[PDB]
Homo-oligomer: A and B are copies of this chain.
Amino acid sequence: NGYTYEDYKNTAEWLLSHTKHRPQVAIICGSGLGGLTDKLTQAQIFDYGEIPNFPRGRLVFGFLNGRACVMMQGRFHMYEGYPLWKVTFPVRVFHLLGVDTLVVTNAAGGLNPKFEVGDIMLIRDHINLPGFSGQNPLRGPNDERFGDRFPAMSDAYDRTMRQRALSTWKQMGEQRELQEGTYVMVAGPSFETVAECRVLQKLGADAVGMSTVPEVIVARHCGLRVFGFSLITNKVIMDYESLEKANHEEVLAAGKQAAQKLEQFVSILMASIPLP
0/1 interface trace, chain A 68-89, chain B, CB 8 Å (1 if under)? 0000000000111100000000
A126 at the interface (CB under 8 A from B): yes
- Inter-subunit contact A151/B204 (CB<8 Å): no
Q: How far is the CA of A203 from the CA of B195 in the complex (A)?
A: 8
Contacting B at CB under 8 A, from A218-251, are 220-221, 237, 240, 242-243, 245-248, 251
Q: How far is the CA of A195 from the CA of B246 in the complex (A)?
A: 25
Q: How far is the CA of A204 from the CA of B201 in the complex (A)?
A: 12
- Inter-subunit contact A204/B193 (CB<8 Å): no
Given A128-B196, A132-B187, 4 further pairs, Cβ under 8 A: A79-B139, A125-B193, A150-B189, A154-B192
Q: Which of A12-20, A50-58, A141-149, A262-270 contacts B (4 or more CB under 8 A)?
A: A141-149
Given contacts A132-B187, A134-B135, A193-B128, contact A245 B155 (CB under 8 A): yes
0/1 interface trace, chain A 178-205, chain B, CB 8 Å (1 if under)? 0000100011111111111111001111
| Closest partner residue, chain B, to A137 (CB atom) | B190
| Closest partner residue, chain B, to A203 (CB atom) | B199
Most buried by B among A149, A199, A221: A199
Contacts of A191 in B (CB 8 A): 150-154
A34 at the interface (CB under 8 A from B): no
| Closest partner residue, chain B, to A238 (CB atom) | B154
Most buried by B among A135, A141, A189, A191: A189
| 5 A–B contacts from the bound complex (CB under 8 Å) | A1-B81, A127-B195, A132-B187, A154-B194, A199-B204
Contacts of A126 in B (CB 8 A): 193, 195-196
